[PDB]
Amino acid sequence: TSKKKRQRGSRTHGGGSHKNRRGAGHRGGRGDAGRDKHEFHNHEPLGKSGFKRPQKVQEEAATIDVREIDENVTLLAADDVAEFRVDVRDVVEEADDADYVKVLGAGQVRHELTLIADDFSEGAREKVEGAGGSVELTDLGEERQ
Amino acid sequence: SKQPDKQRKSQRRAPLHERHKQVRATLSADLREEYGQRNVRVNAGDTVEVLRGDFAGEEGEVINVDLDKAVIHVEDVTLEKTDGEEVPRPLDTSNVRVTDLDLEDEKREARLESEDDSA
Amino acid sequence: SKTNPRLSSLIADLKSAARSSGGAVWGDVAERLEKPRRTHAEVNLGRIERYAQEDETVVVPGKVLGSGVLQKDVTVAAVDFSGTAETKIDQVGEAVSLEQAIENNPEGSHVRVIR
Amino acid sequence: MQATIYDLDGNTDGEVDLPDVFETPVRSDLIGKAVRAAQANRKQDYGSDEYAGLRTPAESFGSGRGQAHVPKLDGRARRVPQAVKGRSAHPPKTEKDRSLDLNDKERQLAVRSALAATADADLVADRGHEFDRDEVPVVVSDDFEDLVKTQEVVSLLEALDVHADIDRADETKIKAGQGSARGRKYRRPASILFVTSDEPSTAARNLAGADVATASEVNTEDLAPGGAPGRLTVFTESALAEVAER
RNA sequence: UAUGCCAGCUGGUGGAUUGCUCGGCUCAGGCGCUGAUGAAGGACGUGCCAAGCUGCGAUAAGCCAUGGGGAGCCGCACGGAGGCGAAGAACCAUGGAUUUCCGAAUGAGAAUCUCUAACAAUUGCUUCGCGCAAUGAGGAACCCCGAGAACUGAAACAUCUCAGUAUCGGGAGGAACAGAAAACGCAAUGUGAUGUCGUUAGUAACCGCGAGUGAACGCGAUACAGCCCAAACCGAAGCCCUCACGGGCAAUGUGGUGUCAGGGCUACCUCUCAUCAGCCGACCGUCUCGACGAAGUCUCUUGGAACAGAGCGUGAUACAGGGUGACAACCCCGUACUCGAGACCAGUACGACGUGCGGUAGUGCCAGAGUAGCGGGGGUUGGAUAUCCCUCGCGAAUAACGCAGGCAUCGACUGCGAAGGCUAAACACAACCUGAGACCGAUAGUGAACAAGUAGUGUGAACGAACGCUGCAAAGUACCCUCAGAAGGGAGGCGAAAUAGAGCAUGAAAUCAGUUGGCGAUCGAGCGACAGGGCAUACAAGGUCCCUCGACGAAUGAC
RNA sequence: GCAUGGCAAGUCUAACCGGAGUAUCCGGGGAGGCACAGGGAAACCGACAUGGCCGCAGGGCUUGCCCGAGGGCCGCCGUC
Numbered sequence A: 001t002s003k004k005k006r007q008r009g010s011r012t013h014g015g016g017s018h019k020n021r022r023g024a025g026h027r028g029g030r031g032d033a034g035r036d037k038h039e040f041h042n043h044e045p046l047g048k049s050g051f052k053r054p055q056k057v058q059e060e061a062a063t064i065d066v067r068e069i070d071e072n073v074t075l076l077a078a079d080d081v082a083e084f085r086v087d088v089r090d091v092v093e094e095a096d097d098a099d100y101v102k103v104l105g106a107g108q109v110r111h112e113l114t115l116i117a118d119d120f121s122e123g124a125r126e127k128v129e130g131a132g133g134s135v136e137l138t139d140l141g142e143e144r145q
Numbered sequence B: 001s002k003q004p005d006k007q008r009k010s011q012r013r014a015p016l017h018e019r020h021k022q023v024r025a026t027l028s029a030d031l032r033e034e035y036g037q038r039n040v041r042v043n044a045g046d047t048v049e050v051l052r053g054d055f056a057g058e059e060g061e062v063i064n065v066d067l068d069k070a071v072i073h074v075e076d077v078t079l080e081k082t083d084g085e086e087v088p089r090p091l092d093t094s095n096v097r098v099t100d101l102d103l104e105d106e107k108r109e110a111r112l113e114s115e116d117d118s119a
Numbered sequence C: 001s002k003t004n005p006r007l008s009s010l011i012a013d014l015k016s017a018a019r020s021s022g023g024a025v026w027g028d029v030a031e032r033l034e035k036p037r038r039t040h041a042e043v044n045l046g047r048i049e050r051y052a053q054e055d056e057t058v059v060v061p062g063k064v065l066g067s068g069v070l071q072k073d074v075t076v077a078a079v080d081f082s083g084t085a086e087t088k089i090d091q092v093g094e095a096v097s098l099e100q101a102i103e104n105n106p107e108g109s110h111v112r113v114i115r
Numbered sequence D: 001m002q003a004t005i006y007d008l009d010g011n012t013d014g015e016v017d018l019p020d021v022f023e024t025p026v027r028s029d030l031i032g033k034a035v036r037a038a039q040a041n042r043k044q045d046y047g048s049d050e051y052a053g054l055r056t057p058a059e060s061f062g063s064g065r066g067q068a069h070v071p072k073l074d075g076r077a078r079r080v081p082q083a084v085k086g087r088s089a090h091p092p093k094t095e096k097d098r099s100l101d102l103n104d105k106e107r108q109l110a111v112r113s114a115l116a117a118t119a120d121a122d123l124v125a126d127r128g129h130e131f132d133r134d135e136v137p138v139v140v141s142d143d144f145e146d147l148v149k150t151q152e153v154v155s156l157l158e159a160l161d162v163h164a165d166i167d168r169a170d171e172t173k174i175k176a177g178q179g180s181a182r183g184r185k186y187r188r189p190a191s192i193l194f195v196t197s198d199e200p201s202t203a204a205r206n207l208a209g210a211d212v213a214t215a216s217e218v219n220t221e222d223l224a225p226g227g228a229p230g231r232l233t234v235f236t237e238s239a240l241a242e243v244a245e246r
Numbered sequence E: 001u002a003u004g005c006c007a008g009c010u011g012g013u014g015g016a017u018u019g020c021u022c023g024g025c026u027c028a029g030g031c032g033c034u035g036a037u038g039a040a041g042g043a044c045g046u047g048c049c050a051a052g053c054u055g056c057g058a059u060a061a062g063c064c065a066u067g068g069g070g071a072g073c074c075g076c077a078c079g080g081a082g083g084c085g086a087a088g089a090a091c092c093a094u095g096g097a098u099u100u101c102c103g104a105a106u107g108a109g110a111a112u113c114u115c116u117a118a119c120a121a122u123u124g125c126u127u128c129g130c131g132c133a134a135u136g137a138g139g140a141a142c143c144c145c146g147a148g149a150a151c152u153g154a155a156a157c158a159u160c161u162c163a164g165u166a167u168c169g170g171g172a173g174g175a176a177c178a179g180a181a182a183a184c185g186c187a188a189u190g191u192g193a194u195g196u197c198g199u200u201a202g203u204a205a206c207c208g209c210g211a212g213u214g215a216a217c218g219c220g221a222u223a224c225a226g227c228c229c230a231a232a233c234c235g236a237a238g239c240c241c242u243c244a245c246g247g248g249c250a251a252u253g254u255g256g257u258g259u260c261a262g263g264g265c266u267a268c269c270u271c272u273c274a275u276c277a278g279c280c281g282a283c284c285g286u287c288u289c290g291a292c293g294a295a296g297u298c299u300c301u302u303g304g305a306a307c308a309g310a311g312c313g314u315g316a317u318a319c320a321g322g323g324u325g326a327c328a329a330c331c332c333c334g335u336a337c338u339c340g341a342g343a344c345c346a347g348u349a350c351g352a353c354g355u356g357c358g359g360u361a362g363u364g365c366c367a368g369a370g371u372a373g374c375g376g377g378g379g380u381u382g383g384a385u386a387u388c389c390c391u392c393g394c395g396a397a398u399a400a401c402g403c404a405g406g407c408a409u410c411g412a413c414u415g416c417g418a419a420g421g422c423u424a425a426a427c428a429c430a431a432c433c434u435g436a437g438a439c440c441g442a443u444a445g446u447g448a449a450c451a452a453g454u455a456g457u458g459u460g461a462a463c464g465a466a467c468g469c470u471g472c473a474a475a476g477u478a479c480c481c482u483c484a485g486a487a488g489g490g491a492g493g494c495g496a497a498a499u500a501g502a503g504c505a506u507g508a509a510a511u512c513a514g515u516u517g518g519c520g521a522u523c524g525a526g527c528g529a530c531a532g533g534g535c536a537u538a539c540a541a542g543g544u545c546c547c548u549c550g551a552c553g554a555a556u557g558a559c
Numbered sequence F: 001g002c003a004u005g006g007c008a009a010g011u012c013u014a015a016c017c018g019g020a021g022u023a024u025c026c027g028g029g030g031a032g033g034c035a036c037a038g039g040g041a042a043a044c045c046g047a048c049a050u051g052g053c054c055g056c057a058g059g060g061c062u063u064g065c066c067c068g069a070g071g072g073c074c075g076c077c078g079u080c
């Protein structure tokens, strides 16, 4: 049995005095009425802030952490096995509707890897090299200077 | 259709030429064999036997066939009014069985005997 | 008010074993499964790998998921495993149902709860 | 496991591997959900006329004549819900979404589970079906599809000690209530479900309570009418195998 | 025991309830224009008897033909009389005939009539004559172009909101509108007419930066289709009416060429299957309508009736639904299967006729002006500097030029050619047809199951109800008595039932008449709850209860 | 938010397409949404698959002592 189903006979259906549930007065005005007066509490404050650059001048990079790559080395058998050699671009999803692929350095790298991507974070290298691996910046990646 | 309201409606409001089918009665064993049909449209000439009402068992000649009310009058199947007069007690054909046909009409006989069509 | 007849039987069986054998885990696990679904365990392999030890049956009062890497040779016992989870585990160890575990160890000994 | 195959005479004629799906654990809750959804999804939207009771300029006289402030026209109360001939306060509405969603995976699991309930004789009998057989479901040679006469299917079923279920469904019930006024006067027990592979069995379909289906599209309602698992089924050699990959 | 209180009984009153459904409500599919060749609508007529409805129109519930259909028929509507039908009626489909007056209403006028040959009025053509033609008005909504609120929200209120909503003016169709880039701008080595649907997204943008308002490109789909002029170069090579003769139009340009895969011209290569025009002309599919169509009306019992129970039997590519004196696959209509016709798809697709695609070189020959663009003032929009439009003023270039890419200018780059035009399909609606339903079931559902937009109200605009059910069959009560009496009553007849006898299935409560039990003319008012006494009680559906004594014997507890 | 259920580092399809027993239903459709990294107005940069100590449930042992998921207090890392 639901709460609704138990209201018959109650008269006020949980509203308290029958004088309460009327028009918008019972809500202090309609919608966000009073967000700066009687109901200012917990409301975002008033005001403008910052700016926005045009959407067609904005770049959306596709990122991935070494942790994701590294954990799936063996499973990624469909990708080079050298002295592994993996082109991140062939690994990252949504890597099409993105302007470039960037490898981030979150996690560990328990293997020696030769990674190919448009860009890497400082920590991404330090780890990949630290595990006897190498990092190769793509032709597009040749936009750092 | 499948809806009862429409079914009864199509029956009560059917035009005259479509009411003949509302006065059809099953044929005797012989006649079914003779004309290759299970039933026919009861004519005011045929002979029929009552198989259901209070007059079940009686046989007689059909004296009248009312298409408007989809009912038939059979000789001797009557009720006695208060004044004493005798009036027919209308019968639904589905409670009757034809045991002898009146083929005085070439078309009916022709229709009955044809195979592609039934009477 | 569980809806799944199997989960319901698992719980009954989990209580039978705890009450009849020298096990406190089974009844313990039974109490947690009785709790709302949102509180049940949802564990990835990366966590089993970090706190499990061989020859010690891992007991998950929930479901096991496939993220991370498991290398230790352990017998993981859970209410259910995702397809990938049961695959990775079976490679380096073994995936088992609480129903099996309860049968091969009613006393519920040498077992570690993970969530 | 293995399932015994039968020929149109009803004699054993070899046997085949009962596919793995029939081993799927029976889940009456999932099956019930699936049936509940198919049943809801074919329901038609309805609702009272949105202007019903509103076609009137009726007005209240307010205070003054010792009368309740009820809109009136020609001395008659109207429009308001407490007024005879007034609008319906919270009536059925056409805009209401009367359908139920169901994840494809969850739905498919239900089909498999319903298929599996078909292989458990005890369940099938608990569901209500009448039969003096031990093995279930009933598997038959693909020549079953070539049958044409209903009675020829009767003979086979009697030879298979399964015709008793049709005798069960050979009783219609004239329901209580006004469903009758809307064309729902009768109802009847569900009997045997025939699952063929090329086309539904035209020869079996008219059997009392019988349902016919094709392995490629047989659904949960087919396997578990009303959501109750364990329908006495009869598959076709090929149907049995094609159903294996649902 | 008067007046009277409480409960019940018999009979009323009343029309709840239960059951029933010829009406609603909603959804889905199909279909879709009518009118001066006088529509839609209205008025008045029209029947043997005819008030209402329906039909019809002085040939008036109908006339003729072809096909279907069939032994009956003369509408709703069960009367009386009479008639029609084998000379094949009724009825149905298609086509035709008749079709009063008012009505856009059109000779003039007028509350449906009148007065003395009429496209009135506005137009095009014109034989300049109303000679040939067009327009007008209607249609449930849908659609296109204009005009355009307020209540309301912002807890007041002015910008904002409600909302380009309500409502108004004009107009088309079966669908409208849009539409082959002076596009887009995931900026690209990329997309490639237009609707619409899903999404992009409550994102960008707007905003007393408050409340609120709110796209697009793209993407996935649906459906797909692309062309014609102006000019250049030609210059009467042309068009319209008429059978013809003949007439009219047309150098202020008919016609050819041509249309950003730019074109033309001069000189060449090659070739056409592009396009445009016309001819032919479906399959399939969908919707509807129709034909055909299996198998019990066997026994016994109950009943007024078998469609019930028990027994025996049968069909099924048919066990949807309905009817029939009660629960029916097999009694009747239908239903499955198969088959036929019409409508839509569609004058579409295919096919065929003709035309002829395209390429090189040269040539500043052509290519839409109050325009592009700027400024003042307004409105509008998400459009912010960067929306769309109106208004006042100003105002260009000529492809070697010009516009666009979300502030302005200049260069570069990329895209694209405005100021001419047409265009199928995919989408909206629901009048009309058919189908459907966990919708309502006569105070419900439409206002309307019935005389329903009826009766009735208002000067008018406009407002607007209520009314369903005899029975299997009318067998709808003969005869007699009474009475002023076709009334009513009594007796009687019918039927299973008249407590089914006319708003005639059932028949609640309030309440009324009569009456039974209890109380009652010396007595006090939330009408009762719980205890206990009196009196009252056919059966059934409850069977317990009382006294002596004895056993057990909590708290408590004596003489 | 919550209860239940499927699937799970993923999850769900929308319109719509094919089939069919033709509004149900079977198959297809991942466009796109939310989740899988954050911080910053922006430019732009880009993180603990565990380093320490407590310790509940549970497990172990030779019955106070170990292991101690979750949890608790810290460290440390990304960014302004």
Ligand SMILES: [Cl-]
Pocket (backbone or CB within 6 Å): A051, A052, A053, A054
């Ligand atoms: Cl930004």
Ligand SMILES: [Cl-]
Pocket (backbone or CB within 6 Å): C042, C043, C044, C045, C047
């Ligand atoms: Cl985890």
Ligand SMILES: [Cl-]
Pocket (backbone or CB within 6 Å): E191
């Ligand atoms: Cl594009």
Ligand SMILES: [Mg+2]
Pocket (backbone or CB within 6 Å): B035, B036, B037, B111, B112, B113, B114, B115, B117, B118, B119
């Ligand atoms: Mg014949």
Ligand SMILES: [Mg+2]
Pocket (backbone or CB within 6 Å): D052, D053, D085, D086, D087, D088
């Ligand atoms: Mg109403």
Ligand SMILES: [Mg+2]
Pocket (backbone or CB within 6 Å): D177
């Ligand atoms: Mg009822």
Ligand SMILES: [Mg+2]
Pocket (backbone or CB within 6 Å): none
């Ligand atoms: Mg006149």
Ligand SMILES: [Mg+2]
Pocket (backbone or CB within 6 Å): E154
């Ligand atoms: Mg206000």
Ligand SMILES: [Mg+2]
Pocket (backbone or CB within 6 Å): none
């Ligand atoms: Mg505005």
Ligand SMILES: [Mg+2]
Pocket (backbone or CB within 6 Å): E154, E210
């Ligand atoms: Mg304010």
Ligand SMILES: [Mg+2]
Pocket (backbone or CB within 6 Å): E213
């Ligand atoms: Mg707006």
Ligand SMILES: [Mg+2]
Pocket (backbone or CB within 6 Å): E216, E217
């Ligand atoms: Mg755009």
Ligand SMILES: [Mg+2]
Pocket (backbone or CB within 6 Å): none
């Ligand atoms: Mg009504």
Ligand SMILES: [Mg+2]
Pocket (backbone or CB within 6 Å): none
């Ligand atoms: Mg009555």
Ligand code: NA
Pocket (backbone or CB within 6 Å): A012, A015, A017, A018, A019, A020, A021
């Ligand atoms: Na209240």
Ligand code: NA
Pocket (backbone or CB within 6 Å): D055, D056, E447
């Ligand atoms: Na009204």
